C-alpha cells in the first residue's frame, strides 16, 4: 500500500510545471527508498531524471515496488487545484488504477479529495552512463533563465565557451551576433550570488535554445543551478530541491554537421 504524506505541497506543485510541457507521459517508478522519475521527450533528444528521496516525506510507506503510468498533463490539471500551503496526502492502492490525491487544508476546515485514472505505458530502462565533467559551473538560477531567455531573440543556437576567466554565451542570427559573459564572484558570500567555475580543460559546444528555455521552467524549485559539461558528452543541468532530491536534465550537443547540412 502506497501512502505518502507531504507537508509542502508547493514542492510537488512546482515539479509538475517543469514536466508539464516537456513530457506528456512517463512511468512513475516508486520504491521503498523514495520516488524515481526518468523518461524522454517526444522528440527523443533530452533526458529528465528526478531523485525524490523518502526522508523528506513526512510519512512514507512502500510495501512493494510499483510503477504507475500517469498522464502528466492530467496530473498538472489536478495539482493546480491545490493551494501553495496545503498538505499533500498522495496515497495509492495496490493495483487499483486509482491515484487518491488528498489535499489537506492547513485551515483544517476544507477537505479536498480527487481520484485520477492510470494509463499503462511501457518501461525502457534508460541507461545513465556516469562520467565525469571537465567544466563545472554553478551560478544563480534567475540569471541563467535570464540569459537563456535573452539569447532566444537573437539566435537559435548557443556557443558556450567555458573560459577560465568566465563562461561566455554567444549566439548568431540574422539580427546580428551577441556574446554575454560573467565574472567569477570572489568576495560575495551569498550562495545566491556566486558564479564559481571549475576548470579542467576549455570546452566549446552548441545547443538548441528551444530546449534550454524548456529546462529552466523549474527555476522556483531552487536558487542555484549547476552546469557540468565536457567534450562530446550531453549537457547536464542540475537543480537541488531543498534536501529531498535533485532534478537533473540531459541535453545532447547539436552535431557539428547539422548546420552544415
Amino acid at each position: 500500500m502506497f501512502e505518502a504524506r507531504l507537508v509542502q505541497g508547493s514542492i510537488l506543485k512546482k515539479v509538475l510545471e517543469a514536466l508539464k510541457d516537456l513530457i506528456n507521459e512517463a512511468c512513475w517508478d516508486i520504491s521503498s527508498s523514495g520516488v524515481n522519475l526518468q523518461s524522454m521527450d517526444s522528440s527523443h533528444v533530452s533526458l529528465v531524471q528526478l531523485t525524490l528521496r523518502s526522508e523528506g516525506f513526512d510519512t512514507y510507506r512502500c510495501d512493494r515496488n510499483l510503477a504507475m503510468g500517469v498522464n502528466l498533463t492530467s496530473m498538472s490539471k489536478i495539482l493546480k487545484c491545490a493551494g501553495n500551503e496545503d498538505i499533500i496526502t498522495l496515497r495509492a492502492e495496490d493495483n487499483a488504477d486509482t491515484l487518491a490525491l488528498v489535499f489537506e487544508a492547513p485551515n483544517q476546515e476544507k477537505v479536498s479529495d480527487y481520484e485520477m485514472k492510470l494509463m499503462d505505458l511501457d518501461v525502457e530502462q534508460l541507461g545513465i552512463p556516469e562520467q565525469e565533467y571537465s567544466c563545472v559551473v554553478k551560478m544563480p538560477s534567475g540569471e541563467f533563465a535570464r540569459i537563456c531567455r535573452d539569447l532566444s531573440h537573437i539566435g537559435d543556437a548557443v556557443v558556450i565557451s567555458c573560459a577560465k576567466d568566465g563562461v561566455k554565451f554567444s549566439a548568431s542570427g540574422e539580427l546580428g551576433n551577441g556574446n554575454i559573459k560573467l565574472s567569477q564572484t570572489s568576495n560575495v558570500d551569498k550562495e545566491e550570488e556566486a558564479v564559481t567555475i571549475e576548470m579542467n580543460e576549455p570546452v566549446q559546444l552548441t545547443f538548441a535554445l528551444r530546449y534550454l528555455n524548456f529546462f529552466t521552467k523549474a527555476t522556483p524549485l531552487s536558487s542555484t543551478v549547476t552546469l557540468s559539461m565536457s567534450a562530446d558528452v550531453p549537457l547536464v543541468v542540475e537543480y537541488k530541491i531543498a534536501d529531498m532530491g535533485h532534478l537533473k536534465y540531459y541535453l545532447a550537443p547539436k552535431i557539428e554537421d547539422e548546420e552544415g547540412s
Binding site: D41, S42, S43, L47, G127, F214, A252
Partner: protein, 184 residues
C-alpha cells in the same frame, strides 16, 4: 450514379467481343476481370467510383457515398479480401500518411513535438517532419531502436485513423482496357 454503373459494365461487355482484345491480354488479367464480374452487383459501385477519382490514401470518414449503404463496411471488407481495396494494413510510408493527415492535425502533431516554427504552410511542416528522419544518433541515447519514424507514423495513424487505396495492378489493367476501348 446509374450512369457510372450503366457505362463501365457496358464498356467491358462490348470490349468482350474482340478476339484481338483477348489476344493482347494474358490469362491473369482475364482472371481478374472474371473476379470483377463475380463481385456483388451492389459491390460494383465502390470500385466503379473511386477508380474514376484521385489516387490517394484517403480515409473513409471523408466518404459520404450512401446510395449503396451508410454502413457498407462489409462490402469494403469483401473488396479487401478479393484484393482491390488495400486497407490501412501496410501503411508504413511516412510521406503517404503525412499527406493523409490534415493540416490542423499536422499543427497538433507539431505541438506535441518540439519542432521549430510549429505554425506554417501545409507542405512546409511535412518536409520539416521528414527532416526529423535524419536521425539514428539521438534515439541511440539508450537502446538503439531507431524507429523514430515508427513513432511518428504510429501517432499519425492514431491521429488519422483508417484509410484505403487501390492496388496498382487492377487500376493499370482496366486503364489499359478503357484506353483500348477509346482508341483516341
Amino acid at each position: 450514379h446509374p450512369y457510372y454503373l450503366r457505362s463501365f459494365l457496358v464498356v467491358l461487355k462490348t470490349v468482350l467481343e474482340n478476339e484481338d482484345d483477348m489476344l493482347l491480354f494474358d490469362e491473369q488479367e482475364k482472371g481478374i476481370v472474371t473476379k470483377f464480374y463475380q463481385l456483388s452487383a451492389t459491390g460494383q459501385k465502390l470500385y466503379v467510383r473511386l477508380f474514376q477519382r484521385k489516387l490517394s490514401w484517403i480515409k473513409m470518414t471523408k466518404l459520404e457515398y450512401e446510395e449503396i449503404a451508410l454502413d457498407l463496411t462489409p462490402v469494403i471488407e469483401e473488396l479487401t479480401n478479393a484484393g482491390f481495396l488495400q486497407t490501412e494494413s501496410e501503411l508504413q510510408e511516412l510521406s503517404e500518411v503525412l499527406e493523409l493527415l490534415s493540416a490542423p492535425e499536422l499543427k497538433s502533431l507539431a505541438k506535441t513535438f518540439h519542432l521549430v516554427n510549429p505554425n506554417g504552410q501545409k507542405q512546409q511542416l511535412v518536409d520539416a517532419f521528414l527532416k526529423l528522419a535524419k536521425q539514428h544518433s539521438v534515439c541511440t541515447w539508450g537502446k538503439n531502436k531507431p524507429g523514430i519514424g515508427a513513432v511518428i507514423l504510429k501517432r499519425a495513424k492514431a491521429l488519422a485513423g483508417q484509410s484505403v487505396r487501390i492496388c496498382k495492378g487492377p487500376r493499370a489493367v482496366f486503364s489499359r482496357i478503357l484506353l483500348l476501348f477509346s482508341l483516341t
